Design an enzyme around this catalytic site. Structure first.
Site, PDB file in Angstrom:
ATOM      1  N   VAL A 275       0.854  -1.180   0.000  1.00  0.00           N
ATOM      2  CA  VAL A 275       0.000   0.000   0.000  1.00  0.00           C
ATOM      3  C   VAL A 275       0.891   1.232   0.000  1.00  0.00           C
ATOM      4  CG1 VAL A 275      -1.863   1.234   1.148  1.00  0.00           C
ATOM      5  CG2 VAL A 275      -1.777  -1.261   1.254  1.00  0.00           C
ATOM      6  N   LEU A 276       0.656   2.131  -0.950  1.00  0.00           N
ATOM      7  CA  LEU A 276       1.409   3.371  -1.063  1.00  0.00           C
ATOM      8  C   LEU A 276       0.569   4.519  -0.523  1.00  0.00           C
ATOM      9  CD1 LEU A 276       2.970   2.965  -4.629  1.00  0.00           C
ATOM     10  CD2 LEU A 276       3.836   2.177  -2.418  1.00  0.00           C
TER      11      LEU A 276
ATOM     12  N   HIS B 213       2.094  16.056  -5.419  1.00  0.00           N
ATOM     13  CA  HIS B 213       3.535  16.247  -5.493  1.00  0.00           C
ATOM     14  C   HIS B 213       4.191  14.937  -5.897  1.00  0.00           C
ATOM     15  CE1 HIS B 213       2.862  20.024  -3.235  1.00  0.00           C
ATOM     16  NE2 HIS B 213       4.005  20.396  -3.782  1.00  0.00           N
TER      17      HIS B 213
END
Lengths: 160, 158, 149, 149, 147, 149, 147
Positions: free
Chosen positions: B120-121, B128
């Protein structure tokens, strides 16, 4: 050159793919349901595997609009063979029209060798705000035969 | 306990991640084999069988709620497709930054045919560039070409 | 116990333990193999690379990192501290520490320069890229404790 | 003809004709050396890699690619086609196809996600970077026929 | 939450059939049969589809929750998953014929709404469960939703 | 070890230890007095209040909370678990547990309903307000482990 | 039907408070308190508004129906009608202070939706019932709807 362009396309997203796919995971499900029971101590969950090894199938296809019927049946056969099945256990029956689909599927479903039946056809018109008689009767036989012969039958027709 | 297993694990990103490894691990076996006789177009396509194949899955321990759903989805995609759970190994990493390094060690083993990357990021609330999500993406791609084995990208963004 | 140096030290500890499991003998079967690292730091050799910009903030991160090593059973003698002038050339200093067989894990601590947020910078984009390429080729874990002010 | 699959296959044809000219010895001189590629595909063995994602549009791109090769004197027998499920692992399969000694050029066809990214895309860059790096290492032409949806 | 309502109805149908199967009253008054809301010593069965996984999992979650909250035991619950919305009637027929199951609950999600004309797929699942309940003399709760 | 139930349990442990220091005898002087709670849970009595919405997620948070109590030296016998139907009336159930002299700390666990984000809701605005008013009047710490899906 | 849900919650809160008021366990195990779904020997109280009479009567209908179906008796139910949506908190305060009532249920219908800004009328009814429950140590179920 014409024989090679027809096989260039893929048959993964057609309606005959998931229609044949549902029969693969249904034949294995009935084997576990009538087999031995669970050992308790937990909730029992039953689900069908996607192993098409040792399963005998049956495909029924209509004759109207062969430019489109042949598209679905080719994608239907590709589902079994790519999932571990064999072409030696596939029976194909052709019928003149959609009215004769339920009667043809009854003969195959009564055989002890056949484990699942797949029905493929094309409906006429359909996009109308009126009741259709030829379209409603084909759904009556397939639903009634499955509940009577204890054998899954897949409804995989398309409307154009 | 039975409440958690009642939910389905079909359609999540862990299902397609393991599904692609099934085809890739069988497509390569056809490539190393003898070529066709000829006189026609030769088309290669991997079957969806999973018998006799060994897999390895790497997962990040961050966001334990979402990871467990994805990990179990990839495991169920192997057993339901003919695979055996005795041939599946699982490793855990503290975060998504340590996935390329851990996935490399599993790929060095001869008895491993595919590697599944699950994680999971953290999605930036403000738009950004991320210096962590880029490194993990390029790390797995370089290992696949160098080690001649397919690694599947199966992470999600919260 | 809450600074970013605490988390980076913890990641370097259990990753080192996990690497020894893979190089060891495999299981006997009859179950699904699962690998996970413990939090025991005894017998482990560590190396710490720290920058020099924002000397007040770096000292807290370095002190927080060394505390976590000795708190989890790690020997104070088995750590190496290397100071680095600028945050740009951290990877070349970290590669030298990780190229010897004595060091098991390498910890990188630094502070990035905050300029224009919505654009792309090249100093920060190369310190992270260089560290990632070092770990895959040296087969050793390298943590990323660099924060942004 | 109007699709990008027509253009992608054409570029791989004359590039292969250019590479075989460099293998031969140079001329005597008396003029500057200029090298050109022809539109003849006789004796050329090409490989095609396509992705199954969004197969409604991919089938049109592979239609033009396979129509131009037979139009320019290329026989259908020596064309190898490999399908992949996703565009992420396009160069993974192309690495094994291009490594064969019986192949000359590799054409990759795929469809990506829409291009209104905020600053960057983590998937569209990997497929392009992998093919360019692969071509230089193996010294074999690779055509980028992927079209963004 | 139609999953809670469907499971609640099946709870008080087993007691109603047990009272009818049991001995009658002693007379001298009107005979009234009622269904209690206690799931003690009752074994159920749940059939669920795999279309719109987000919606189905919410309905299935309330199905088990309703039984355990009303005194039921998780040990006596059987769960079957089916591919699509078409196969529930044939799947429920095999499950309802077991002698260790007193009630069957069907969970599913339809595709279209109610503004178009007659839907052939939606009619078959409703007709199949109705005939099975009368033929097998066993309650089968119909608790699907319409998208 | 990373769920929100772990953090809520830890806060309830050291706050209980800190409260005993203030009620005890003061220092002898000659220095600036600083008070901080330890992480020893021996001899402490705890009460846990949990909701019922999202039963799958609540079980992990409750299991994570009870694990932290016994891991830090707390006796398993000295905890009380109370289940609550809805997240709206958690404060009235929590007040009863905190009104007895046996319970030292009260932990509240629940899941809020996510509807329209930019507006103001009244179910979530009253569960937090009621818990805050209970702590100031009962002179006992009450943690807030309620999360939002 | 939020009337059924509001009445169901108040049923299992009286048993939870009765168990807490009763003697504790014998130890040697974890102490867990649970609320049963049996309304035997329980006296309730319902407060309802008189705005949007069609909607309120549907919600009130399920309130009494929930109690009687779960074993409750219609004799031990008290019903109070109030003019508007503003007066429920002051009306419920007098009813909840009686020693013969174990739970109070509030039923009402709001005027506006949720898209406009902060509504002063909607906040007062929610704040009043919350303070009464803590001050009187008696559960008060909040089950109004929003138009």
């Amino acid at each position: 050159l014409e024989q090679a362009i027809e096989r260039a396309g893929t048959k993964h997203g057609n309606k005959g793919w998931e229609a044949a796919l549902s029969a693969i995971e249904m034949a294995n499900l009935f084997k576990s349901l009538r087999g031995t029971g669970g050992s308790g101590s937990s909730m029992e969950i039953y689900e069908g595997k996607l192993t098409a090894e040792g399963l005998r199938f049956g495909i029924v296809a209509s004759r109207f609009n062969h430019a489109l019927v042949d598209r679905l049946v080719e994608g239907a056969i590709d589902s079994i063979v790519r999932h571990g099945g064999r072409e030696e256990d596939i029976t194909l029956v052709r019928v003149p029209g959609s009215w004769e689909i339920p009667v043809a599927a009854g003969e195959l479903a009564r055989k002890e060798d056949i484990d699942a039946v797949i029905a493929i056809g094309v409906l006429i018109r359909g996009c109308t705000p009126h009741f259709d008689y030829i379209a409603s009767e084909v759904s009556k036989g397939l639903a009634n035969l499955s509940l009577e012969l204890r054998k899954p039958i897949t409804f995989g027709v398309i409307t154009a």
